[PDB]
Amino acid sequence: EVQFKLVLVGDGGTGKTTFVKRHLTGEFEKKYVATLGVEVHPLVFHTNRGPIKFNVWDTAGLEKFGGLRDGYYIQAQCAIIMFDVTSRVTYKNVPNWHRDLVRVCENIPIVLCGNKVDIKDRKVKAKSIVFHRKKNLQYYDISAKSNYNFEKPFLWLARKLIGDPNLEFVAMPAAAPPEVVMDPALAAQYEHDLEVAQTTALPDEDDDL
Amino acid sequence: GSMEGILDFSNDLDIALLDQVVSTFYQGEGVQQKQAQEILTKFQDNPDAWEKVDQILQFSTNPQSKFIALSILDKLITRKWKLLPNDHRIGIRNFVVGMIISMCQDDEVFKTQKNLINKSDLTLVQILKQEWPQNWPEFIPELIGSSSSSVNVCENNMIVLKLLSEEVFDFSAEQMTQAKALHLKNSMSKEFEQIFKLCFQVLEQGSSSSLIVATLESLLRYLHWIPYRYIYETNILELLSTKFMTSPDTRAITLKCLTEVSNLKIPQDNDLIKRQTVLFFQNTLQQIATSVMPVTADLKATYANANGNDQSFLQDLAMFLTTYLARNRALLESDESLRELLLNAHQYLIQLSKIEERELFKTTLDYWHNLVADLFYEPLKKHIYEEICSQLRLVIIENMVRPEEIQLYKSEREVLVYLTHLNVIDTEEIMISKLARQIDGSEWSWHNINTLSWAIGSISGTMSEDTEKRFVVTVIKDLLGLCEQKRGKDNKAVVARDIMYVVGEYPRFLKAHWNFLRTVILKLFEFMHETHEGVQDMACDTFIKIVQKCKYHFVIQQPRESEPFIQTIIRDIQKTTADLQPQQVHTFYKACGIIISEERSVAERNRLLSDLMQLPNMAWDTIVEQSTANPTLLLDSETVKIIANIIKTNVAVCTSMGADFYPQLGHIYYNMLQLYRAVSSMISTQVAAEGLIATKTPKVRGLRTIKKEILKLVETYISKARNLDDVVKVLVEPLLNAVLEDYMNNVPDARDAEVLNCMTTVVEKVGHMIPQGVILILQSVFECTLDMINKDFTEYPEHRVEFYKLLKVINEKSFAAFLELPPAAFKLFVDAICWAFKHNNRDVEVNGLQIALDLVKNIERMGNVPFANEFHKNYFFIFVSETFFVLTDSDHKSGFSKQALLLMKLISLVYDNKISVPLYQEAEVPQGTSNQVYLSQYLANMLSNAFPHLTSEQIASFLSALTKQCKDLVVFKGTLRDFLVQIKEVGGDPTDYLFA
Amino acid sequence: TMEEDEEVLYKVRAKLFRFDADAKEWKERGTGDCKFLKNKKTNKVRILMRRDKTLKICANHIIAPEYTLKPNVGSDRSWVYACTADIAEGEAEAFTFAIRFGSKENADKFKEEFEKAQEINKK
């Protein structure tokens, strides 16, 4: 197993933490809790070339919670710059994030990600998004919410870092699950917990799944 | 443990401890990493931390520590520098310069500590922005001098000059005052002669590739602003386009330089310059062909292989060729000796266009769009590019995406349309032969038949009708044969979908061939019985698409038919739609609505509408009867679903018929509003019996769906209505009685935001005609909605949006309703407007600012009367200060433009003496005093308290500029942005506000 | 993959949630194909669910005879059940799961199949 430091940068509220969390646990966090400085999480993908680990440095986009700022970028091997296709300012700031990043990390693969393409009223039109071209960034439209192009940033970085253009994500192996006996002592415990769960509504009952 | 020690400033700093904390952060894991993180952040943000930098830079052995030290120094330099005595500023400056030279004179450090050197260089540049040139006239002479002493120093000096050029020309706009940006730009301009001499000498004298690369990196930045003569009147063009293209170390940066060279502002009427522009292109392409790859090379393969920096190189080549050719290809077009160069450059672009890389493809496609548009219009030019265009036809056709990808499909379509016009025979031949390769299996796949079908569809309307006729027949024959050929429902459904697609894109053909059109529709009806996935959706989608284009053919009696075909569709509608899902049924009824709206005889239109709505109306009649006979029956899950689907069918038909829908709305209107009440009762009852959780249950969500579809139906009709007198006389009063009290008297969680949306449409369309109705709307929804949304910025997001949309339209159409509010309620209205200003959500913020603008306008209109004078006395300063808050707090940048517009309006009111009464209360200022003098005083005081680090002089100069510029929005905005820069630092120059 | 030894009894698109008890809320664990896999050696039927896009495991547990599918108050196309030993994230753990489908029909079919599997697992 080989590990790579990945820094995630972009304006507050663009979907950085939401995107990473979805990748870590599968959950979609609807609430906006501004990152304080940085959150560091390991993230592993299984490939045809074996497992690849990203040390994800999910940095704060809001100036007041910026912490060490470019101090987070030191020894980064790859990066995602994020903006929100529903907020023009977030795309206007993409060159600022890129500037700060490449002054510290001169020769790294970087993906530009326009997040929130699930939202009908898009404000940053496809035709406007050209900044990646002269800077040799990969670009993806993504949605942390719909999972549109969800895996694409990591697959592209994996190909770049391993140096194999035919690297694929593969199905992680699935061990036989164990048989357990129901604990007689925890019988009453589970009645309670199941009671509460049944009477709490599942979110987004209007979605396709 | 010990780690928190560094935060204790009452003791001296333990550098070994700092280095451990830093190591734990950068190299540690989990809990340890997180704790170190928090500690470092608090260290760095300590306002005296900068005092420790000297100590850290001298005595630390951890380069990451030194990096963070320089971060701390940068905060001081950019925010508080001008507080320092001159001696201290010179001290810091000298220390930084000394550290840079020292790290450069050590080869080992220079090689291995690039991070720290680059950070140091940036720190130096932050000092230059503060100190240079006024306080450091010798900086550039000394840098130039120091460059000859050592290759490392010279190389690092190129990094400094690059960063300087970026900070002054590329990133100054948002970070400096207009005056300071101009000062630094003029300063660099004045000393550039000397800087260029150094760069040119390095490029000529050569040797060290790392030095040469750094020098070309700085040149790239210079090219954003330097005059053309430094490029065209020196040898540098030749060096870039020959020497530096041959070696791979310099080739990437050189290509980017030549791209920017191609963008210089250059004289247009000068033959020598034209020849020079030709020559550097010729040289560059010759070096490519000889040192990198020939014109014939398979760039698709090379890119895919992704060796070394090949991908970046090929991207950069595409950018260079497209940039140069889009500006200069006319230079290559008339001289027969430049024909081969012109066509080789375009051949490279054809090869680049074959690379499987979406974003690169789009770059080349933008160029191809420019070229073929030109060949469509420019005389005697298409013949030059015949073989290029032929290859490009194949590239576009093989790369056609689904129309769902709207920008890319649009771009591709437009290029293919232009190319089809330029040679229709070539396009046809390519499409027919691609079709043959589908039929013979050699290129058969779902992706490939799909992409071909999309390409064939995209050029509809480009051929003559006769040519199109033969082409369409050939294509449909071939696809039909393909369909027969294929085995298994999967295969047949793919081709059948593609047939449907192509036919739907050729309405001109359908319109000429009634026999064929009828067959197509009848086949679509057959397909609406196929459960194989995707088939029913494509059948329905194709039906409505054909109807949108060919509707007139369904409403006339075609010769040899007994009746208009719409009658035939309606007669059989039960059977046709029997196997469709509800949403598919709705599309079907919508399509029928499109047809019926073509019938302009009223009696016939109304009869068709009656016949179309037969099955929904009969289901409705039975339910309304049974349902009101027995209110119980509505509890049934299945009935609720039937009702919702009846309402949805009404919405679908009203969507396509608008004003023509009225007789149908009239048939259901009164019982529909009774159902709204009955459903509302059940929801109220269920929430009482079961709690707020009830609103999550399938039964209550079913009931609410009925309410929302009813509101959607009424909103749809009213938004398109032509007879507003009937809207007011017949629709509005029952609507308000049915929905307003129900909204008010439900708990927050049971209130439908759709009510607000419906009311917005009502006020929009007929607000002027129902002044008492608007008052009733405000009384019903205003205070109870405000109370839902005024505790935070997140709760009830739909209500939030719809609420300010409603207030906006009321403020536009029936301002009188706000005059009728009691003082306390009017105060809540002002509170609500300012609350919207403070939102990050852009829908709300923008409506908030617009309401404020419109409100000021509405008060102005009233002229000199008590209400207007009382408004100003009570609220003028609330609006001025609330607007300043959101302008200056850095959390509301998306609203800058409208905040500025609002502030400009407010200031201009006082500057023009357009406010009749004193804004100050008695015994606060000499009693004669003008509102202009008092506004000045109040703002000076307000800004002084909010920004105590500003001088009186800064504030007075700012306000003086602001008031003089309150009739010139772009200049006013400049002054605001200047102020936003100055508040982030100490000691901003007050003369900056005189910028002109 | 370690699924070559197994027969696919039932397959259906689903969204899976786990109940966090710290905050009384459901959290998504994955969306994709939920599969009932019968091991050809032991005849034991498990649920194996993989996420779209990444193919990472969001459910891996035996369909224990003692589990009961219960309705959720919010849905007519979901089941909730306690699972005592799921190994999606390595270490066998207890979870309260909720699984939601495209339709009531899918949910009812799932229930039918889950019971058939429970019976297979009783042998």
Ligand SMILES: COc1cc(C(=O)NS(=O)(=O)c2ccccc2C)ccc1Cc1cn(C)c2ccc(NC(=O)OC3CCCC3)cc12
């Ligand atoms: C109206 O004569 C047809 C119309 C259709 C038709 O409309 N088919 S389909 O709805 O698209 C469809 C889609 C998927 C699966 C199956 C089908 C049937 C089909 C067959 C035919 C007869 C036929 C057999 N041969 C081998 C053909 C070759 C070419 C064409 N051209 C065509 O005569 O055009 C017009 C010119 C003058 C009036 C008619 C027709 C035919």
Ligand SMILES: Nc1nc2c(ncn2[C@@H]2O[C@H](COP(=O)(O)OP(=O)(O)OP(=O)(O)O)[C@@H](O)[C@H]2O)c(=O)[nH]1
């Ligand atoms: N519609 C939609 N909302 C999204 C999407 N991704 C994230 N969001 C929401 O947008 C907000 C983004 O929050 P975060 O992910 O915390 O934002 P962030 O970029 O980490 O912000 P900082 O940490 O402050 O830099 C949350 O409310 C998310 O639920 C998306 O793809 N679509």
Ligand SMILES: [Cl-]
């Ligand atoms: Cl979601």
Ligand SMILES: [Cl-]
């Ligand atoms: Cl200048």
Ligand SMILES: [Cl-]
């Ligand atoms: Cl030109």
Ligand SMILES: [Cl-]
């Ligand atoms: Cl017509």
Ligand SMILES: [Mg+2]
């Ligand atoms: Mg975050």
Ligand code: NA
């Ligand atoms: Na210091």
